[PDB]
Amino acid sequence: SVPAIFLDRDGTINVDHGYVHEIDNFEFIDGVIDAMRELKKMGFALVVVTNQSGIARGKFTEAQFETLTEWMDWSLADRDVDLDGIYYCPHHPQGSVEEFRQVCDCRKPHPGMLLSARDYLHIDMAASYMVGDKLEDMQAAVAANVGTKVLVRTGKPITPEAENAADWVLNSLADLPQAIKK
Ligand SMILES: [Ca+2]
Ligand SMILES: [Zn+2]
């Protein structure tokens, strides 16, 4: 088994601009690539787990998401961050794209994406971390038995509910390796 950092994308890796689907609108938050290289170095698996309901909404396609995601993956790999998994949920109950219109158990706060990563990569759950900007990220993490639940301030101007469900509140993912060391 391996401990992991589970990662939100929007608001945690990239700046949340609303339905980010183009390379030209993807902007890594300051210090997050270096922080991830350090988290790799300290021996964590890194696993993205992202809700992408813009797909169900018909904002962008699965093909556009894969194009953006291949790019993000290479762009991290080239900076010596090698991601262990990238999981995403394209669904929404009210989606207008029929393929993707459904209730599912991968859509955060449902824990399914973290569970699939857990079985695939054989993850030590209680030794693991979930980093996100939203309450659903905290709720997915509790359901999944993630040892430590970290809310960041680089996405959703946080809510009192999100803050209640979290263990740590950090300014950003860029602050996580020092918070883990101490
Ligand atoms: Ca987010
Ligand atoms: Zn889903």
Q: What is the CATH number of the domain that holds 61?
A: 3.40.50.1000
State the distance from the centre of ligand 2 to the C-alpha of 52, rounded, in angstroms.
Answer: 9
Q: Quick check: is 30 catalytic? A: no
Q: Quick check: is 10 catalytic? A: yes
- In sequence order, what are the beta bridge partners of 89? 51
Q: Are residues 117 and 87 in contact, defined by beta-carbon separation less than 8 angstroms?
A: yes
Annotated binding residue at 51?
yes
Give the CA distances from residue 20 to residues 45, 58, 85, 140, 164, in Å, rounded to whole numbers and listed in that order: 25, 13, 20, 22, 28
d(CA 25, CA 18): 10
Number of domains the chain contains: 1
Instruction: Return the ∠ at Cα 52 (arms to 174 and 36), rounded to 5°.
Output: 20
CB atoms within 10 A of CB 99: 11
Q: Torsions phi, psi of 33, nearest 5?
A: -65, -50
Instruction: Return the ∠ at Cα 172 (arms to 166 and 176), rounded to 5°.
Output: 75
Q: Are residues 132 and 10 in contact, defined by beta-carbon separation less than 8 angstroms?
A: no
Residue with tokens 């990238």: 86
Does residue 7 come out as left (phi exceeding 0), alpha (psi in the -120 to 50 range) or beta? beta
Annotated binding residue at 110?
no
Helix, strand or coil for residue 168?
strand
DSSP 28: B
Structural domain including 169 reads 1-182
d(CA 158, CA 31): 20
Q: Are residues 121 and 4 in contact, defined by beta-carbon separation less than 8 angstroms?
A: yes
DSSP 13: T
Q: Contacts by 78-81 with C-beta closer than 8 Å and gap 24+?
A: 79/33, 79/37, 80/37, 80/40, 81/33, 81/36, 81/37, 81/40, 81/46
State the distance from the centre of ligand 1 to the C-alpha of 18, rounded, in angstroms.
Answer: 10
Q: Torsions phi, psi of 5, nearest 5?
A: -100, 115
